[PDB]
Amino acid sequence: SLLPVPYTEAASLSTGSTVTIKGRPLACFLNEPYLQVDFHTEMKEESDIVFHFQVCFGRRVVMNSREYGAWKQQVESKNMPFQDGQEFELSISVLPDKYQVMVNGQSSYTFDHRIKPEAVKMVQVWRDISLTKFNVSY
Amino acid sequence: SLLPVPYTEAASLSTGSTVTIKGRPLACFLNEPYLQVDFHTEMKEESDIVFHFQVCFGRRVVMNSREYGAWKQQVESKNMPFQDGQEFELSISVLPDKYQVMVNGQSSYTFDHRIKPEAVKMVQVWRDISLTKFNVS
Amino acid sequence: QPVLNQPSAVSVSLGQTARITCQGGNFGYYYGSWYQQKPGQAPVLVIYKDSERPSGIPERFSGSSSGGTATLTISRAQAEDEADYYCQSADSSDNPVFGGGTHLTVLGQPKAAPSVTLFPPSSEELQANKATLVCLISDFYPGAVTVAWKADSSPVKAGVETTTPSKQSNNKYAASSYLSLTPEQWKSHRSYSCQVTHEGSTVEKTVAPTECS
Amino acid sequence: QPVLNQPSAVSVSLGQTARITCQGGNFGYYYGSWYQQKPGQAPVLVIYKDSERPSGIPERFSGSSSGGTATLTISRAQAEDEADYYCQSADSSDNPVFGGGTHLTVLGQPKAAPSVTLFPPSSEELQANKATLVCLISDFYPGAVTVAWKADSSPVKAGVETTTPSKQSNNKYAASSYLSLTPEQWKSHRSYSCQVTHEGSTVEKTVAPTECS
Amino acid sequence: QESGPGLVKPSQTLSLTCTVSGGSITTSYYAWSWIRQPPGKGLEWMGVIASDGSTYYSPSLKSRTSISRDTSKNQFSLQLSSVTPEDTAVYYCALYIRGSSWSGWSAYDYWGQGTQVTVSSASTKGPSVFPLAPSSKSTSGGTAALGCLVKDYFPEPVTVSWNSGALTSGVHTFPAVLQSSGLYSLSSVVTVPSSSLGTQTYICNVNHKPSNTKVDKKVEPKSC
Amino acid sequence: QESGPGLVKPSQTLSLTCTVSGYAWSWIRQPPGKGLEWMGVIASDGSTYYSPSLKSRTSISRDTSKNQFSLQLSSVTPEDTAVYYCALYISWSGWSAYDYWGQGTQVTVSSASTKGPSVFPLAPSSKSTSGGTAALGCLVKDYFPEPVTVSWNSGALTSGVHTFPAVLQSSGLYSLSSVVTVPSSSLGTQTYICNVNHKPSNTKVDKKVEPKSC
Secondary structure, three states: OOOOOOOOEEEEEEOOOOEEEEEEEEEEEHHOOOOEEEEEEEOOOOOEEEEEEEEEEEEEEEEEEEOOOEEEOEEEEEEOOOOOOOEEEEEEEEOEEEEEEEEOOOOOEEOOOOOOOHOEEEEEEEEEEEEEEEEEEE | OEEEOEEEEEEOOOOOOOEEEEEEOOOOOOOOEEEEEEOOOOOOOOOOOOEEEEEEOOOEOOOOOOOOEOOOEEEEEEOOOOOOOOOOEEEEEEOOOOOEEEEOEEEEEEEEEEOOHHHHOOEEEOOEEEEEEEEEE | OOOOOOOOOOEEEEOOOEEEEOOOOOOOOOEEEEEEEOOOOOEEEEEOOEEEOOOOOOOOOOEEOOOOOEEEEEEEOOOHOOOEEEEEEEEEEEEEEEOOOOEEEOOOOOOOOOOOEEEOHHHHHHHHOOOEEEEEEEEEEEEOOOOEEEEEEEEEOOOOEOOOOOOOOOEEEEEEEEEEEEEEHHHHHHEEEEEEEHHHHHEEEEEEEOHHH | EEEOOOEEEEEEEEOOOOOEEOHHHHHHHOOOOOEEEOOOOEEEEEOOOOOOOOOOOOOOOOEEEEEOOEEEOOOOOOOHHHOEEEEEEEOOOOOOEEOOOOEEEEEEEOOOEEEEEEEEEHHHHOOOOOOEEEEEEEOOOOOOOOEEEEEEEEEEEEEEOOOOEEEEEOOOOEEEEEEEOHHHHHHHHEEEEEEEEOEEEEEEEEEOOOOOO | OOEEOOOOOHHHHHHHEEEEEEEHOOOOOOOOOEEEEEOOOOOOOEEEEOOOOEEEEEEHHOOOOOEEEEEEOOEEEEOOOOOOOOHHHEEEEOOOOOOOOOOOOOOOOEEEEOOEEEEEOOOOOOOOOEEEOOOOOOOOOOOEOEEEEEEEEEOOOOOEEEEEOOOOOOEEEEOOEEOOOOEEEEEEEEEEEOOOOOOOOOOOEEEEEOEEEEEEEEEEOOOO | OOOOOOOOOOOOOOEEEEEEOOEEEEEEEOOOOOOOOOEEEEEEOOEEOOOOOOOOOOOEEOOOOOEEEEEEEEEOOOHEEEEHHHEEEEEOOOOOEEEOOOOOOOEEOOOOOOOOEEEEEEOOOOOOOOOOEEEEEEEEEHHHHHHOEEEEEOOOOOOOOOOOOOOOOOOOOOOEEEEEEOOOOOOOOOEEEEEEEOOOHHHHEEEEEEEOOO
C-alpha cells in the first residue's frame, strides 16, 4: 500500500502530462516538515533537475531548476493551501508554456518552462512525508 | 536492522549523559538531504524544544531552541565533517554549561544551554536519513 | 508587564534563619539568581544558577528552586542582611525578568538612643528673608521616631516636614526634620525647640536668635 | 565567448529549397529561434520555439528541431531572401548563446555590366590645396574587381584607396577607389585615367584638369 | 563608571554611557546589559548587547530603545526615545562575567553605581545652599559638628563633598525631605574635633547636577 | 529606439539608452564583422542577469517612469568597440527570442579624436545628353569615425541616389562619396545640395553642387 520514500520512477513527460502525488506529511506543521519533488534528466539522482518543487509545510513553497548542476533563480511562493495533518492530492499539469500545480484540484503555483519537459527521464519524490499513490496521466 | 524514522523516544538527560546515534543519509549531498535532532520537553512532538540540531548536508549546520513555541536566536555553523554517502556516528555530550556534539566520536559543534537539560522528557530523531541505532547514556 | 511575585517584607530575629521565596515565576526550564541591594548603594550578586555564590559571599547564603518557585535561604542572619533582595529569571533565553522586591528586616539588633543636632537659621537665610531650623537625628534603632516642635513653650505643628527614617552605613537609622519659618517669627519669639521621641524616651534642644549659640 | 555552430555562407538557386542547421550547441534542454538580418538593418524574428512561425512571416519559412539540431527551412526562395541568418539558443536559462551567422545567396540572377563614373578634383579641393579622384562602379555582378590608375599613360598605385565590394539596394555590388594627388600633379599632367577590370573586361573613364569635362 | 545624568522633559530622548572598566581588570568587555529601577520599585530590564550574539530588546521598550557601542572608546550607550514620567528611574550598567554565552537567566556580578534620571514637565530649580556655623561652645573633650544647608532644590540627587573631597571620616550626609510644595532639601554634617577651628578650614562643596549648579560654601566660625 | 554618443576615451565609462514606444529588455552587441554576443537582460517583473565575460564590467539600470533602460560598460578599452542592439522580449529565459529589435548604433572606442569631414562637391559632367543622363555626386573626405548619413536636398531627392560605403585610408581616416542620377535637362533651375551629416562629431555640412564652368 505504502510507496517507499525516496520514491524514484522513470518517466518521460510532454505537453499534456500530469504528475499525481497522494500522500501525508510525517510531522505536524509546527515542526516544519518538508516535501520535495524533482524532475531529473537522468536516472542518477545527481543529474540535472528540470523542475524542483520544495514545500516547507506551513511556511512557504520554493521552486527552481538545476541546469548543468547549477541552481538557477529560485521562485518563492507563500501560498500554503495544504492543511495540517490531512492527506493531500498533489497534481502537476504540464502546459506548453508553464506548469499547473493544483492542490486538491485548486490552483496554487505556476512555473514557466526553463527546460523543455521532454528532457525529464526520472521523477523522485522524497522528504519527510508519507507517500501512498503516484501516477502519471495524459 | 533499521529503526523507524521519525524516531521518538522518552529520555531524561543530565551532566554525563551521552546520546549515541548511528545512521546514514538517504540522499547524496548535492541534493541536500537534511538531518534534524530535536530534544523535546514532553512526549508530544509539539512541545518546546530544548535543543534543536538540524543539518543541511553539504552546506552547513544550524542549532536553535524553541521556547514556548517561539524560535530563539539561531546559531549557524559551516563545519561539515559528514561525508557523502557514508555512515555517520552522532554523539552529543551533555556538559554543565553547554552541549558537546561529536561527529563520529570527534567534536564538531557546541551549543550553550538555554534551558537546563533536566526539562527534557523526549528525544526525537527525524529527517532524510536512515536510522540503525539509538542509545541513551 | 512581566514581573516575578515575591513578598514585599519579611522579618527575622538575629540568629534565626531567613527564607525569601520567588513565586509565580518560570522555573524548571530556567535558572535563578539573587541580588542584595542596600539603600543608595549598587546591588550585589548573592546567588547565581540557584546554588552557587560568587566570591566574597559567605556560606550563609543558599538558594533552592522547584517547579515555578525559587527560595533564597540565609542560614545565620546578621545585621548586614537587612536590605532589599531581588530574584531574577527569564521568560525566555532572550528576555530576563526581575522580582517585585523583598525588604528583609533583621530583628534582635541592639537598641540605640537618638542623637539630636539643632542649628538656627544663618544670617544668610535671614539675609535671604527666610528662616529654617535643622533638627538632625542619628544613631537610633529602630527607625520609628516622632518629632515635636515648640514655640518657646508652645507646640508648632504647621509647616513641619519630617523625613522617613533610613539606615546609615553603620546599620543605624537616620532622619531629619525641617521647619519653614519667616524672619518675622524667628526674631519675634524668644526661642524654638525640637523634641524627639524614641521608645518613649525624649530629647529636646533649643536655640535663640539674639543669643549666640 | 559561446557561439553556436552554423555555416558561414550558403548558396541556393531561386525556386529551390534551402536548409540551414543549427548544430553543436547545448540543446536537448532548450528551444531554438531564428533571425533574419540584412547589413546595416535590424534582425527580424522568423521562427520561435522551433515549430511555430509568427504572423507576418511568409509561409515559405518553417523550422524543425530534433535532439541537438535545429533546421531552418525556406521552401520557395525569392530574391529578397538573400541576407544573413542567425540561430539562437541558450547554454543555461540565465545565459543565451548566438550562432555565427549564415549568409544565404539567391542564385540564378542574371549577370550585369558595370557603370563607371569618374569625377575630377573640385575647384574647392584644389582651392583647399588637395585633389581627389573618385572612380565609382555600380550595377555589377559579381564583386571581384581590380582598379588601375594612370598618369597620362603610366600606372599609378601609390595613394590609391580601394574599397571592399558591397551590394546595392538592387542586389548588385558597388565599390570605389580614391587617388590622393596634389594640384601640382593635377595641373602638370594632361589627364588622369581610371582603368577598371571586372570579369576580364575593361571600362575606362578619363578627365583633364584645364579642360572642362 | 557611569555618566550622563540629568532631568528631561517628556517626549525627549536622553543618552547614558558606561565607561571602560570602573574597576574591572583584564576585561574582554563581554555582555553589556541595561537594567533600570523606578523610584522605590523593583528592577526592570531594558536590553542587552553580547559579543558572541548581537543584541536583544524587551517588547514593551523594543520600539523606544536604542543601544550603541564604540569599542575604540570601549563604551556603549543607551538612547531611550519618547520618554514619559514612567521612565523616571535609576539606570544601572551591568556586566556579565561568566564565559558562557549570554542567556536571559544569566546574572551580572559587577553592577554600575547607577544614576538618577527624572522625567517630568517641571523644570530644574537651583539649590539655596547655606553654611552652618559650628557650635560656639568650648569643650573639655573636643567636639564640633558643623554642616551645610541645601534648600529648595529639584530634582534629586545632590552630591555633597567636603573640602573638595578632603574629609571622609565621620561625615554624615542626611537625606532630603519632600515638601508639600514638591521640592527637596537636605543637609550634610561632619563630626570634627573642636580643638583647632582656625587652622583647618572646612568648606562644604555642594553640587547639584540636574541643574548643574556647583556651589562650594565657605563655612566659618560664628563671631560672638 | 536607441540613443547615446559614439565617441569615448579609453578607460572611461560609456552609456547607451534604449527608448520604448508603442516584457524583458536585453542588450546584444556585434563586434565588427563578428557574430552576435549577448551582454545582459533586465526584466520589469524580475531582476537583472549578466554574462560572465561581461559580468564584471556591465551594469544595467531601469527608469520605469520613463519606461527606458540604460547600459553602462565601465572602464572601456578599444576591445569594447562593437555595434550595439537593444532587443525586446515578448518569464524570461535564455532560449527566449526577441521580436522587436532596435535599429542599432555604432560605437567606436579608440584613442583618436573626431575629425570633421573635408566635404567637397563634385560638379556634374558638363556633357549634355539627348536622352538625359547625369550622375553627379558629393565627396566626404577625411572623417573619423563611421558612419555618416548623406541626404540630398534635405531628403527631397531619392531617385537614382547612390551613397557609397566608406574606405579605410592608409592615413587612418574614413572617406565615402554619394552620387545621384539626375536628368541633364534642367541644370540652371534645380539646385542640388548634398546634406551630409556626421553624427559622432555632430558636423552638418550641406555642400552646394554646381556645374563646372566651361
